[PDB]
Amino acid sequence: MVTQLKSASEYDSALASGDKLVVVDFFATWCGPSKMIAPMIEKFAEQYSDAAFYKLDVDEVSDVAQKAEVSSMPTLIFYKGGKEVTRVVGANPAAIKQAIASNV
């Protein structure tokens, strides 16, 4: 349900799906909080099917993470028409859930 973006072109294509809400979980394989939020994000994805959910390894696609100014993981960025509406920093389930609910 949460699709890994493995290149810039994948990320660009995902953000270009347009109109509906796009969520991207910026994570790292070495990052404990990343590994904890991950099943949480999967369950939010099953719930809020009106939005498209993605994950991106900041160490695999560092150019996309750096341009998005991701300095901390987890960072979920919320996009509409290819443009950021809001982001939530940290393993903060309730804050992420609220950010989805009011942007879907």
Binding site: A28, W30, S72, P74
Partner: protein, 174 residues
């Protein structure tokens, strides 16, 4: 000599990793951030910069950087310092671990900067040649007020001396 002239930021940049009070209490996953020297100086009216040859080296660890951490609250609250920048050529992860081992809990007003290849530090002539084209930072201090260098001094003998680069010397010019 740099004193009474504009800070020569040029297009020089540094990397640092943030520290917040949430850390050393919770688990965090911070990554390096790139800061343009020009932006740091235009966004911050009062900036202290100090150079250190090597993260975790004993002279720096025992006799130099602790003073800046000890006076940090005083520098910010009493002397209106916006940023204290500790500059090394060390990788930003090593610098961040050094800051935490020294008791830094918050990078809001103090940042441990990586100057990759010693490019900025060489540009102002404050480098330490360590052989076969390898340069570390020398031990130095600088004060920048409204983008103008008011104080700049390098240790002649960084092996033995923390004099003109000490936080105490810096306090005397604030």
């Amino acid at each position: 000599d740099l004193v009474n002239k504009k800070f020569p930021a040029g297009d020089y940049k540094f990397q640092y990793i943030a520290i917040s009070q949430s850390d050393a209490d919770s688990e965090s996953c911070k990554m390096p951030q790139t800061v343009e020297w020009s932006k740091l100086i235009s966004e911050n009216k009062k900036v202290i910069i100090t150079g250190a040859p090597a993260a975790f080296s004993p002279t720096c660890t025992v006799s130099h950087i602790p003073g800046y951490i000890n006076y940090l609250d005083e520098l910010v609250k009493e002397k209106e310092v916006d940023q204290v920048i500790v500059v090394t050529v060390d990788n930003p992860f090593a610098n961040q671990a050094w800051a935490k081992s020294l008791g830094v809990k918050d990078t809001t007003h103090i940042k441990f900067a990586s100057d990759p290849g010693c490019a900025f530090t060489k540009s102002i002539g404050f480098e330490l040649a360590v052989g076969d084209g390898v340069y570390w930072s020398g031990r130095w201090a600088m004060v920048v007020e409204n983008g103008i260098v008011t104080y700049a001094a390098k240790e002649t003998n960084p092996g033995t001396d923390v004099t003109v680069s000490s936080v105490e010397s810096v306090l005397a010019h604030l």
